[PDB]
């Protein structure tokens, strides 16, 4: 080795300035810590190298210190952080670690293995890059140890340090726990460093760019044999270091991906001049698919990095306010060992970014302050549509001459929602910029098939466009595949449990998506109207293009390994159908592949909307019971994706305590009237019948004279739906009833049958608890419901479509997630209010005779109030149980009710304790909003 590589021609060198500034705090830390001088892991990433071309992780569930707020507080973790050989740290027990040397044993061992992993995986040497990575790792090791790591072990480590602190009070009795941890680290930095650098070439030296003229180098093997740690990064706040490491990954990856794109799109040799969408421009009038295959994930990757960058930039400013202005409390329960850089004028994110720009890999066409058009974020000049030049029709009589409505998403930038705009905003702008109206003169006897634009709303500056129908079709399909990926990819954020606060942005995005899906289904139908007269599409317009769909999209499925198993299921379903075509050139294969793609995208739109309902959006402040229900639903969704498969459990019916008065009249006779399919059939039947029963109960009470309150009927339908789901799940309150018992008897019978007969679930260890569940088959039934609950709701609203509508025209109520005891308390309170109102008016309508009526009134009201007192008492006890668990961190730190109330409590002001009374601390908590 002993070579000179990895560029780095210029200075500024943010790593080195931050590494240097830290020397003064290091010196301080060294002295005060001395005052107290007295006192396989890689298996998880064994096959992962450090330089894989992946973006940063901006996930709130993994990274601490990212406010659930919209558009800010980012601290996106680097690839390396995610792959640290820390399984041996996870296995640290409080019981086992007693001594300061026990901590060192575990840390030093981890450092030796981490060291080997980092150096062995690097195709480098001849540069400081390998030891730079070790220094970055060293600092994260210290952050983990010290409890300052943004990325249950932390609690164990704190417990261990508390035990050390408590066992050896002197001299540590003068210290906070944080000081004890910091000093332990400071005292042993050298041993940890030496362990980390054990695996190194002699030619490797840790290097600091103190200035463009002053160059400081460590001893042979990056200081392994040196009397000091050559690096001060551990002191550098993790947020700052992550921002710097992030820039190196961005710099490096962008350059690699960009070179791959350039080869894919343009080459003077052989006159290759490809467009963004996979077309050969200025060609003679196949190969350019490769341009599309690489531009698509490239643009997406840059968009994700753009967001990561911007969110971190905002966090920088927030950190500055916290420690630079330092007003009032200013988040005092933290130890950053002083911002310091305030006096080096790094109060402005832009000053910091200029410093950061000269990282290892951007140090030479990247400018991180260039937020203008065509900045580092903008996609290659090559990833654009060629404007009809590189280096311009007549109806066959009455032969299927039809005009199709076309929504053209266009090509501009990422963020499909904003791109669509108008379309997403409303139906009023369907005749807007993205609307195209095409008249396709398509014959099945002649090949003189052309499509013309009737109107241009985005093409108004262009000559009227006329194109061949087969190309038209190709374009339409090509865009559907591209748009599919972009919608699905961008909405991945919304699908995967977006905490509890970002409702308005996803609600708007999910609704646009579904409108878009319906629009595409209609476009598909309108295209098929030209061919369904025969159901034999001439080969020119049949497959040939849809066939080549696997030329792209499939070639990107493995790249976008974000959907994991779900994308594997899609690929398999489409693969089977396309394989049919490959084996047989013609056979209704095209239509089938498109139907598969639509069923997939429709399912996502349903899932998206259902996890972002209108009732879950915001109207200490009061948080609605519906917002917590949305939370539990998001959990159920995630659990199903991990446990089983929606495709495995979703059926198709075309193929197969004081009890509320509504429940007292619920139908269990649907059973008296593809095991999952047979079950779905029986359920949908019950759903429609009960909805019809309720309508009739209140049809007789629809005289529009004191009967104008639509809420009675809406609520009855929603409560019935929720109770039905609980029956299906098999988790209810109503026992000792033959109707209910027979229902549960058959329900446990069918699910056992489902487990044994149906595929996939036939043999999953995940589900091999049903025979020992309480109730039996609880797990499978809950997942079945999660998979089939929308179909059930749809049946009920269909039954009621010609009656009084119930809230929103779309989405499904979250009421099946709200625990039944809480649903019944709410219902009874409303029932009592109505019952009491009726007695009141009779009394007022009714001198001695009114006094007698008053006594009768009081008896009826009292009866209802006493029943209420009993249930409200139970509420209070379950609420207190939630406080009891919360005071110890929560459950494991009516129980589902308790679990529900626990999360509601915390959202409304309670705190996860190792008297914050709020709105839901009382049974009356639903009254004053």
Short mmCIF file of C-alpha atoms in Angstrom, two decimals, residues 64-310:
data_model
loop_
_atom_site.label_atom_id
_atom_site.label_comp_id
_atom_site.label_asym_id
_atom_site.label_seq_id
_atom_site.Cartn_x
_atom_site.Cartn_y
_atom_site.Cartn_z
CA UNK A 64 -34.10 9.62 18.10
CA UNK A 65 -34.44 13.37 18.12
CA UNK A 66 -36.57 13.67 14.95
CA UNK A 67 -39.76 15.55 15.93
CA UNK A 68 -42.93 13.90 14.56
CA UNK A 69 -43.33 17.43 13.10
CA UNK A 70 -43.80 17.98 9.36
CA UNK A 71 -40.80 19.02 7.25
CA UNK A 72 -38.02 19.32 9.86
CA UNK A 73 -35.68 18.08 12.64
CA UNK A 74 -33.82 15.51 10.56
CA UNK A 75 -30.88 13.43 11.79
CA UNK A 76 -30.67 10.69 9.09
CA UNK A 77 -28.32 7.88 10.04
CA UNK A 78 -25.43 6.76 7.78
CA UNK A 79 -25.20 3.32 6.23
CA UNK A 80 -22.36 2.38 8.52
CA UNK A 81 -24.27 3.18 11.72
CA UNK A 82 -26.93 0.71 10.66
CA UNK A 83 -24.39 -2.06 10.16
CA UNK A 84 -22.16 -1.82 13.28
CA UNK A 85 -21.01 -5.28 14.62
CA UNK A 86 -22.84 -4.67 17.90
CA UNK A 87 -24.64 -7.95 18.65
CA UNK A 88 -22.18 -8.45 21.51
CA UNK A 89 -23.28 -5.12 22.92
CA UNK A 90 -26.95 -6.08 22.65
CA UNK A 91 -26.19 -9.15 24.74
CA UNK A 92 -24.83 -7.08 27.63
CA UNK A 93 -26.64 -7.84 30.84
CA UNK A 94 -26.87 -5.78 34.00
CA UNK A 95 -26.51 -8.92 36.03
CA UNK A 96 -23.25 -9.84 34.34
CA UNK A 97 -21.51 -6.46 34.16
CA UNK A 98 -20.38 -5.36 37.57
CA UNK A 99 -16.92 -3.88 37.15
CA UNK A 100 -15.55 -1.08 35.01
CA UNK A 101 -13.40 -3.81 33.44
CA UNK A 102 -16.47 -5.83 32.53
CA UNK A 103 -17.66 -2.87 30.51
CA UNK A 104 -14.25 -2.63 28.93
CA UNK A 105 -14.27 -6.27 28.08
CA UNK A 106 -17.48 -5.95 26.10
CA UNK A 107 -16.49 -2.68 24.44
CA UNK A 108 -12.94 -3.65 23.58
CA UNK A 109 -14.10 -6.91 22.07
CA UNK A 110 -16.67 -5.11 20.02
CA UNK A 111 -14.05 -2.63 18.87
CA UNK A 112 -11.72 -5.39 17.72
CA UNK A 113 -14.43 -7.05 15.63
CA UNK A 114 -15.70 -3.74 14.33
CA UNK A 115 -12.15 -2.88 13.39
CA UNK A 116 -11.69 -6.05 11.41
CA UNK A 117 -15.01 -5.60 9.66
CA UNK A 118 -14.30 -2.06 8.60
CA UNK A 119 -10.87 -2.63 7.25
CA UNK A 120 -11.49 -5.99 5.54
CA UNK A 121 -14.47 -4.71 3.61
CA UNK A 122 -12.65 -1.66 2.21
CA UNK A 123 -11.18 -1.68 -1.35
CA UNK A 124 -8.98 1.22 -0.24
CA UNK A 125 -5.70 1.74 1.71
CA UNK A 126 -3.25 4.41 0.44
CA UNK A 127 -5.63 6.92 1.99
CA UNK A 128 -6.89 7.89 5.37
CA UNK A 129 -10.41 6.73 4.43
CA UNK A 130 -10.14 3.43 6.23
CA UNK A 131 -9.05 5.03 9.57
CA UNK A 132 -11.47 7.88 8.97
CA UNK A 133 -14.18 5.26 9.03
CA UNK A 134 -12.67 3.74 12.14
CA UNK A 135 -12.63 7.15 13.80
CA UNK A 136 -16.27 7.66 12.93
CA UNK A 137 -17.05 4.25 14.38
CA UNK A 138 -15.05 5.05 17.51
CA UNK A 139 -17.12 8.11 18.10
CA UNK A 140 -20.37 6.15 17.70
CA UNK A 141 -19.08 3.52 20.06
CA UNK A 142 -18.58 6.26 22.63
CA UNK A 143 -22.07 7.64 21.96
CA UNK A 144 -23.63 4.27 22.58
CA UNK A 145 -21.70 3.87 25.82
CA UNK A 146 -22.42 7.35 27.02
CA UNK A 147 -26.16 7.14 26.22
CA UNK A 148 -25.96 9.90 23.61
CA UNK A 149 -26.67 7.78 20.52
CA UNK A 150 -29.57 8.97 18.35
CA UNK A 151 -29.69 5.53 16.64
CA UNK A 152 -33.54 -1.46 25.33
CA UNK A 153 -29.65 -1.71 25.60
CA UNK A 154 -29.38 1.91 26.54
CA UNK A 155 -31.43 1.24 29.65
CA UNK A 156 -29.20 -1.66 30.58
CA UNK A 157 -26.09 0.43 30.12
CA UNK A 158 -27.50 3.24 32.24
CA UNK A 159 -28.42 0.68 34.89
CA UNK A 160 -24.87 -0.69 34.88
CA UNK A 161 -23.38 2.75 35.29
CA UNK A 162 -25.82 3.49 38.11
CA UNK A 163 -24.74 0.28 39.81
CA UNK A 164 -21.10 1.31 39.47
CA UNK A 165 -21.92 4.80 40.76
CA UNK A 166 -23.88 3.45 43.70
CA UNK A 167 -21.36 0.74 44.68
CA UNK A 168 -18.45 3.20 44.58
CA UNK A 169 -19.98 6.41 45.74
CA UNK A 170 -16.67 8.05 46.42
CA UNK A 171 -15.49 9.90 44.25
CA UNK A 172 -18.52 9.50 41.95
CA UNK A 173 -21.02 10.87 44.50
CA UNK A 174 -20.16 14.35 43.30
CA UNK A 175 -21.26 13.47 39.78
CA UNK A 176 -24.41 13.19 37.74
CA UNK A 177 -24.90 9.87 36.02
CA UNK A 178 -24.02 11.48 32.70
CA UNK A 179 -20.73 12.73 34.11
CA UNK A 180 -19.95 9.26 35.40
CA UNK A 181 -20.51 7.79 31.95
CA UNK A 182 -18.55 10.53 30.20
CA UNK A 183 -15.58 10.14 32.46
CA UNK A 184 -15.51 6.37 32.14
CA UNK A 185 -15.33 6.86 28.42
CA UNK A 186 -12.73 9.64 28.64
CA UNK A 187 -10.49 7.57 30.90
CA UNK A 188 -10.51 4.54 28.63
CA UNK A 189 -10.52 6.18 25.16
CA UNK A 190 -7.03 4.88 24.47
CA UNK A 191 -7.85 1.26 25.10
CA UNK A 192 -10.90 1.38 22.93
CA UNK A 193 -9.00 3.10 20.16
CA UNK A 194 -6.16 0.60 20.30
CA UNK A 195 -8.65 -2.26 20.13
CA UNK A 196 -10.35 -0.68 17.12
CA UNK A 197 -7.10 -0.16 15.21
CA UNK A 198 -5.69 -3.65 15.88
CA UNK A 199 -6.42 -4.64 12.30
CA UNK A 200 -4.50 -2.21 10.12
CA UNK A 201 -1.60 -1.94 7.70
CA UNK A 202 1.51 -0.23 8.99
CA UNK A 203 1.15 2.29 6.13
CA UNK A 204 -2.19 3.49 7.43
CA UNK A 205 -1.99 6.70 9.45
CA UNK A 206 -4.73 8.77 10.96
CA UNK A 207 -4.51 12.18 9.43
CA UNK A 208 -5.65 15.65 10.35
CA UNK A 209 -5.83 18.53 7.89
CA UNK A 210 -5.20 21.21 10.50
CA UNK A 211 -4.64 23.71 7.69
CA UNK A 212 -3.63 23.64 4.07
CA UNK A 213 0.02 23.88 5.26
CA UNK A 214 -0.14 22.10 8.64
CA UNK A 215 -0.50 18.36 8.32
CA UNK A 216 -0.63 16.13 11.43
CA UNK A 217 -0.06 12.40 11.18
CA UNK A 218 -0.45 9.53 13.62
CA UNK A 219 2.01 6.71 14.14
CA UNK A 220 2.29 3.41 12.27
CA UNK A 221 -1.03 1.46 12.19
CA UNK A 222 -3.20 4.64 12.86
CA UNK A 223 -1.85 5.15 16.31
CA UNK A 224 -2.21 1.53 17.55
CA UNK A 225 1.19 1.82 19.31
CA UNK A 226 0.81 5.57 20.08
CA UNK A 227 0.57 7.21 23.52
CA UNK A 228 -2.67 9.01 22.65
CA UNK A 229 -5.80 8.62 20.62
CA UNK A 230 -5.01 10.48 17.33
CA UNK A 231 -8.63 11.50 16.91
CA UNK A 232 -11.02 13.79 18.76
CA UNK A 233 -14.21 12.83 16.87
CA UNK A 234 -15.94 11.15 19.83
CA UNK A 235 -16.37 14.64 21.38
CA UNK A 236 -17.86 16.04 18.10
CA UNK A 237 -21.67 15.95 18.60
CA UNK A 238 -23.23 13.02 16.81
CA UNK A 239 -25.59 15.17 14.85
CA UNK A 240 -22.70 17.15 13.34
CA UNK A 241 -20.66 13.97 12.61
CA UNK A 242 -23.70 12.25 11.01
CA UNK A 243 -24.21 15.30 8.80
CA UNK A 244 -20.57 15.02 7.68
CA UNK A 245 -20.66 11.28 7.12
CA UNK A 246 -23.90 11.76 5.25
CA UNK A 247 -22.28 14.17 2.90
CA UNK A 248 -19.59 11.65 2.08
CA UNK A 249 -22.16 8.99 1.28
CA UNK A 250 -24.15 11.40 -0.81
CA UNK A 251 -21.01 12.60 -2.73
CA UNK A 252 -19.73 9.09 -3.39
CA UNK A 253 -22.98 7.50 -4.33
CA UNK A 254 -24.16 10.27 -6.56
CA UNK A 255 -20.96 10.05 -8.56
CA UNK A 256 -21.18 6.27 -8.96
CA UNK A 257 -24.84 6.25 -9.88
CA UNK A 258 -24.31 9.15 -12.24
CA UNK A 259 -21.62 7.33 -14.18
CA UNK A 260 -23.86 4.32 -14.51
CA UNK A 261 -26.67 6.52 -15.82
CA UNK A 262 -24.46 8.24 -18.30
CA UNK A 263 -23.40 4.95 -19.83
CA UNK A 264 -27.04 3.88 -19.89
CA UNK A 265 -28.31 7.05 -21.71
CA UNK A 266 -25.62 8.71 -23.83
CA UNK A 267 -22.58 7.87 -25.96
CA UNK A 268 -21.19 9.60 -29.02
CA UNK A 269 -19.83 6.24 -30.08
CA UNK A 270 -22.66 4.57 -32.04
CA UNK A 271 -24.80 7.73 -31.65
CA UNK A 272 -26.66 6.64 -28.52
CA UNK A 273 -29.03 9.39 -27.45
CA UNK A 274 -31.72 8.06 -25.04
CA UNK A 275 -34.56 9.86 -23.28
CA UNK A 276 -35.86 9.54 -19.76
CA UNK A 277 -38.72 7.33 -20.64
CA UNK A 278 -36.71 4.73 -22.54
CA UNK A 279 -36.93 6.12 -26.03
CA UNK A 280 -34.25 6.38 -28.73
CA UNK A 281 -34.34 10.06 -29.95
CA UNK A 282 -33.41 11.07 -33.50
CA UNK A 283 -33.37 7.35 -34.33
CA UNK A 284 -34.03 5.77 -37.76
CA UNK A 285 -37.82 5.71 -38.48
CA UNK A 286 -35.13 -1.48 -27.68
CA UNK A 287 -31.69 -0.52 -26.15
CA UNK A 288 -32.85 2.73 -24.32
CA UNK A 289 -34.82 0.72 -21.84
CA UNK A 290 -31.52 0.68 -19.95
CA UNK A 291 -31.66 4.58 -19.59
CA UNK A 292 -35.09 4.28 -18.03
CA UNK A 293 -34.02 1.45 -15.79
CA UNK A 294 -31.24 3.52 -14.27
CA UNK A 295 -32.84 7.11 -14.33
CA UNK A 296 -35.94 5.99 -12.51
CA UNK A 297 -34.26 4.81 -9.23
CA UNK A 298 -31.65 7.54 -9.64
CA UNK A 299 -34.20 10.34 -9.61
CA UNK A 300 -35.96 8.70 -6.71
CA UNK A 301 -32.74 8.31 -4.77
CA UNK A 302 -31.83 11.94 -5.27
CA UNK A 303 -35.28 12.99 -4.16
CA UNK A 304 -34.92 11.00 -0.98
CA UNK A 305 -31.48 12.42 -0.31
CA UNK A 306 -32.80 15.90 -1.00
CA UNK A 307 -35.35 15.46 1.69
CA UNK A 308 -32.80 14.02 4.09
CA UNK A 309 -30.54 16.99 3.52
CA UNK A 310 -33.22 19.58 3.95
#
